[PDB]
């Protein structure tokens, strides 16, 4: 039924700084011809009590999709941490990449992230307002949840 | 709204409402079960084999038995044949039988002319005590002093026996021929002070009665009916049940019974047997002639309800179970199986059956 | 017995609250499948929240396509063809 | 005050049972929740049994399943206790908001 | 005219007789008139229904400008009548109910027989809240009289048994005039808490619940539910006895006006910031803090779920 189907994810610098920009190498296929452009979107949540605190951090379209199989680089620069809670940015959260075909999303790839200072003196201490450049985000890539849904495609 | 509708609705819905149930139809209906404390024996292909002892009332008609059955329950209880292990020839019938809390092996009975016997499941009938000269219904075993009877009978006469000790077992060791006005409808033994007993009598007095003291009488309560049975609590010391011909379950403090601390409503005529549960404490189940039974969470006596479940009845009756087509004569809850229950109906039916809430 | 308001209400009865019909050992025992050796006291209603969630969207979809075939019964299928719109779901690719 | 019953004997039927296989949620109340459902709604539809037993298995499915993923949220948080914010994060994670 | 038929609800006029005459209709006249809430027979039908707004005294005037004389048509007064206290009430005398009232109001010392519960002033008023037992007479006396509000006023509302004694009965007045604001209905049930907890001391201990809360309407929206609520709440709280504090069938009004004073409450305490800070609280506390509130459990989780979405 599906066209484009996603093989696989594979983030590239991991663990990072949690500044540093995520990048994915996307690997999937197409099965025949289509018109329309795919939509790659990548939301971070910012916190677990509500979803205001989500932030969109940035689209990338790319089109027309070579029939076989492609390769991807998606990248886009970290959250803005002035919109995420002073006591939500340390620990686990979790970040969603979407891929959907001409405004329709048939694939969603939920990641867990654990973000971490980076010494032990710090977690162990870590102090009143967070250090920013000493914490380190770890994105559990190994087995992400990803849903697959069916859409109309051409 | 008839009996066998009743019992199609109640059949149709068995699955949703118990884990287990067997209903199996006696040759003659019996007036007395309980279960017997056999350890839970692992089977072959999922079979756990519990022992019962079960009761004949033949009126007159053929010889009555002291029957020893053995039911075999699927494994997933404890987390299809029903056998007659003995039989034993037995006078009249037995309304009520216990086996010896100490020893197993021995069973009391009381039989319809107050007659007292000693049976034993290895040889048979060991005693004869007869002291009743009228059909009897009170017979309890002391949990706490070994071979410490009391028997009951209509002739207004409690009678205490002694049968641990081999000496003399077959004259009572004390004698109440004044205790109450009329029949002794029930009397129980307290399960922790082990001189203390309880009696409800059709003079509509309830008795907490002491065998040290001289008085004999500690505690005397006017029922608003006739009470037919009570219980002690198993985990309370002071706590204390009963039940009559008015229907509602009264519930009693040993250390002011002046007042009831309060009063259970739902069954709807007389109530004949009484139990509070050994696992689970505030459990309490009763059988009355509305071919009724019911069992009742007393932690939950007077909860906050939603209103959708509010119409269903008070908040402390755990359930109900109508698989019965007419009075109940006896049940007994399995001591080894928390919720597995027995139960034998006027017709000629045993049931066994545990319920599906498995939340205590 | 003690009861005041025990009357017969003007109307119709109608269905409040019964996602507190989901007995709390219930939650937990769903919680032990799935390896959730200690739970917290206060995660029950959270738990209640998104069971009625998901039950609402599954029950909606169920009768809109129900709805759309045109019938007046939502049968096993139905179900089925409503949890189709829930995507399907692996752990790693 | 109870009362002997005439002795009437028994031939033949004058023997039935019932075993009981099922998942963690009882089916009384679940029927309760959903036809609770049904009538917000306002739906007329009728709701078959088989179909309530479906959504009780897809119900309890789904709850096994974030379960587990409560459960590992909280394992990357290094405690064992699941609380309030785990089971936010793991429905999070199937893109409910 | 072809027009013999009326509404109960708007036929029903219901008044309390201060130095002026408070009139409104009530909610509900369906336990008296049936289902219907109507009343076929009498063309131009008024029902005065009235109380002194000190000693409650109900004095019943029916008036029709024309009534059907057929056997089957119903007897409005006679059925109203049946629910008022028996030969306790003034039947179209006007006269007769203000002289009855004037001297009853000589010697009604509501507040001389009652056990005080506490105090409390709204506007610049003060109210005085009393509680009393359904077996003294005068109580007995006042509660029927004041009893039909529980029927005109509470969806389902059934009289209670005034035997029992399990019965207690609170009354909100007006203290430097007598006049009553209102009244609550409670009652103790017993509460088992294991057989340790009950073995240990001899007290018998209570779930005490709140059965029939009633404001008259002339007095309502003035704050006076919610300090008669927080009045008893409190009484409760000091109360040894006392374990858990449940409502009967609360409909929303109640569910609202308990959730406002409830959290009110709990902020007063500072549950607020303990859970706002902590998500690790352990069942221990937690039990300890329900137990202490004395608030029944799911209205505990309400409450918890509640505070944690504040500011
Ligand atoms: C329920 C009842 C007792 C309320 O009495 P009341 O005197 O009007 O109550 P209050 O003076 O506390 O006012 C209550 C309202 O004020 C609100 N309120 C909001 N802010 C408030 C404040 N700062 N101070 C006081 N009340 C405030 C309450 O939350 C409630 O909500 P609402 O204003 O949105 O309606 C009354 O409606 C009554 O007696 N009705 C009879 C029928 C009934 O429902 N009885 C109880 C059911 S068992």
């Known amino acids: 039924m599906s066209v484009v189907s996603l093989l696989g994810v594979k983030i590239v610098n991991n663990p990072a700084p949690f500044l540093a920009p995520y990048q994915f190498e996307i690997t999937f296929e197409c099965l025949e011809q289509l018109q329309k452009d ?42 803005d941490l002035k919109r ?25 790839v939920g990641y867990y992230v654990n973000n971490e200072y980076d010494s032990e003196e710090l977690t162990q201490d870590p102090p009143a307002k967070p250090i920013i450049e000493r914490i380190r ?6 087995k992400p949840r990803v849903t697959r849904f069916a859409i109309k495609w051409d | 709204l008839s009996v066998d509708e009743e019992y199609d609705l109640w059949k149709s819905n068995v699955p949703l409402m118990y884990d287990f149930v067997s209903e199996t139809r006696l040759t003659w209906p019996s007036l007395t079960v309980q279960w017997l404390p056999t350890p839970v024996q692992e089977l072959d292909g999922g079979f756990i084999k519990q022992e019962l002892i079960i009761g004949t009332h033949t009126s007159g008609e053929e010889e009555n ?8 329950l699927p494994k997933e209880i404890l987390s299809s044949n029903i056998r007659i292990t003995a039989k034993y020839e037995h006078e009249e019938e037995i309304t009520r039988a216990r086996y010896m809390p100490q020893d197993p092996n021995i069973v009391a009975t009381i039989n319809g002319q107050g007659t007292v016997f000693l049976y034993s499941r290895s040889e048979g009938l060991q005693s004869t005590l007869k002291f009743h000269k009228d059909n009897g219904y009170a017979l309890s075993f002391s949990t706490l002093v070994k071979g410490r009877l009391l028997s009951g009978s209509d002739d207004h006469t409690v009678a205490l026996w002694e049968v641990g000790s081999g000496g003399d077992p077959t004259k009572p060791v004390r004698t109440w021929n004044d205790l109450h006005s009329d029949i002794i409808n029930d009397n129980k033994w307290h399960n922790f002070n082990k001189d203390l007993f309880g009696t409800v009598s059709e003079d509509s007095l309830l008795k907490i009665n002491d065998v040290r003291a001289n008085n004999t009488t500690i505690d005397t309560v006017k029922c608003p009916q006739p009470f037919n049975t ?11 049940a009963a039940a009559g011909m ?12 002046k007042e009831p601390l309060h009063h259970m409503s739902g069954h709807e005529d007389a109530v004949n047997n009484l139990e509070f549960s050994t696992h689970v404490d505030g459990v309490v189940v009763s059988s009355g002639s509305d071919n009724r039974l019911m069992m009742w969470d007393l932690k939950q006596i007077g909860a906050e309800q939603t209103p959708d479940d509010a119409e269903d009845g008070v908040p402390e009756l755990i359930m109900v179970h109508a698989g019965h087509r007419s009075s109940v004569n006896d049940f007994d809850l399995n001591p080894q199986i928390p919720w597995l229950v027995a139960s034998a109906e006027e017709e000629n039916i045993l049931q066994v059956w545990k319920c599906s809430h498995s939340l205590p | 017995k003690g009861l005041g308001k025990g009357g017969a209400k003007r109307h119709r009865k109608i269905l409040r609250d019964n996602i507190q019909g989901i007995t709390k050992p219930a939650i937990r025992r769903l919680a032990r499948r799935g390896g959730v050796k200690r739970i917290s006291g206060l995660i029950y209603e959270e738990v209640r929240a998104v069971l009625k969630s998901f039950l609402e969207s599954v029950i909606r979809d169920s009768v809109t396509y129900t709805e759309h075939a045109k019938r007046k019964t939502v049968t096993s299928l139905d179900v089925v063809y409503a949890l189709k719109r829930q995507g399907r779901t692996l752990y790693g690719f | 005050a109870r009362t002997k019953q005439t002795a009437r004997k028994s031939t033949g039927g004058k023997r039935r049972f019932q075993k009981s296989t099922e998942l963690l949620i009882r089916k009384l109340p679940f029927q309760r929740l959903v036809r609770e459902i049904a009538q917000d709604f306002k739906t007329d539809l009728r709701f078959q049994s088989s179909a309530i037993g479906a959504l009780q298995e897809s119900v309890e499915a789904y709850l096994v399943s974030l379960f587990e993923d409560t459960n590992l949220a909280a394992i990357h948080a290094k405690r064992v206790t699941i609380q309030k914010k785990d089971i936010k994060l793991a429905r999070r994670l199937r893109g409910e908001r | 005219k072809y027009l013999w038929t009326s509404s109960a609800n708007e036929a029903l006029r219901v008044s309390i007789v201060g130095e002026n005459a408070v009139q409104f209709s009530p909610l509900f006249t369906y336990p008296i008139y049936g289902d219907s809430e109507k009343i076929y027979g009498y063309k131009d039908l008024i029902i005065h229904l009235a109380f002194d707004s000190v000693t409650f005294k109900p004095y019943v005037n029916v008036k029709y400008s024309a009534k059907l004389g057929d056997d089957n048509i119903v007897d409005v007064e006679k059925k109203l009548l049946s629910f008022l206290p028996k030969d306790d009430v003034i039947v179209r005398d006007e006269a007769k109910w203000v002289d009855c009232f004037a001297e009853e109001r000589k010697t009604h010392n509501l507040s001389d027989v009652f056990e005080k519960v506490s105090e409390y002033s709204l506007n610049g008023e003060e109210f005085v809240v009393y509680k009393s037992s359904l077996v003294d007479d005068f109580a007995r006396r006042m509660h029927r009289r004041v009893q039909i509000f529980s029927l005109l006023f509470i969806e389902a509302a059934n009289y209670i048994d005034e035997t029992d004694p399990s019965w207690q009965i609170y009354w909100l007045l007006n203290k430097k005039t007598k006049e009553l604001i209102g009244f609550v209905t409670t009652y103790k049930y017993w509460h088992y808490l294991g057989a340790k907890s009950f073995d240990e001391d001899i007290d018998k201990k209570f779930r005490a619940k709140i059965s029939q809360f009633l404001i008259f309407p002339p007095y309502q929206n003035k704050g006076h539910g919610s300090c ?26 109640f569910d609202d006006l308990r959730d406002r004073n409830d959290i009110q409450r709990l902020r007063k305490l500072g549950y607020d910031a303990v859970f706002q800070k902590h998500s690790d609280l352990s069942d221990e ?8 509130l004395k608030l029944e459990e799911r209205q505990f989780n309400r409450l918890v779920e509640m505070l944690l979405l504040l500011n």
Not at chain 1, 41 to 66: F, H, M, N, R, W
Not at chain 2, 230 to 240: D, G, Q, T, V
């Open chain 2, 246 to 257: 008015d229907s509602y379950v009264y519930l009693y403090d040993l250390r002011n019974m």
């Open chain 1, 137 to 142: 985000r770890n994105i559990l890539a190994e």
């Open chain 2, 65 to 72: 038995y002291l029957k020893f059955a053995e039911i075999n």
């Open chain 5, 285 to 292: 506390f937690l039990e300890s803090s329900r137990k202490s």
């Open chain 2, 230 to 240: 009570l219980a002690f609590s198993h985990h309370s010391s002071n706590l204390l």
């Open chain 5, 228 to 253: 008669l609520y927080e009045a008893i709440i409190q009484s409760w709280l000091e109360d040894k006895s006392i374990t858990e504090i449940t409502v009967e069938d609360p409909n929303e009004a």
């Open chain 1, 38 to 79: 795919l939509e790659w979107k990548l939301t971070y949540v910012g916190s677990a009590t509500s979803s205001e605190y989500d932030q969109e951090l940035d689209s990338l379209l790319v089109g027309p999709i070579p029939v076989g199989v492609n390769k991807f680089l998606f990248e886009a620069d970290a959250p």
């Open chain 1, 84 to 108: 995420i809670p002073t006591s939500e940015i340390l620990g686990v959260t979790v970040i969603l990449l979407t891929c959907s075909y001409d405004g329709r999303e048939f694939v969603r």
